[PDB]
Amino acid sequence: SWHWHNGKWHWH
Amino acid sequence: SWHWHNGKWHWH
Ligand SMILES: [Cu+2]
Ligand SMILES: [Cu+2]
Ligand code: NA
Ligand code: NA
Ligand code: NA
Ligand code: NA
């Protein structure tokens, strides 16, 4: 099924 | 550095 992925701040 | 990941619709 569909899965919403929230936006997020990703530390590189 | 910081990296903004947009939210998205992910098809499983
Ligand atoms: Cu997903
Ligand atoms: Cu990232
Ligand atoms: Na979802
Ligand atoms: Na995921
Ligand atoms: Na960015
Ligand atoms: Na990524």
Side-chain angles (χ1 to χ4, degrees):
Chain A
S1 71
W2 285 105
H3 179 211
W4 172 251
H5 293 189
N6 281 307
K8 67 182 262 203
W9 292 106
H10 181 218
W11 172 247
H12 294 196
Chain B
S1 71
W2 285 105
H3 179 211
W4 172 251
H5 293 189
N6 281 307
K8 67 182 262 203
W9 292 106
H10 181 218
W11 172 247
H12 294 196

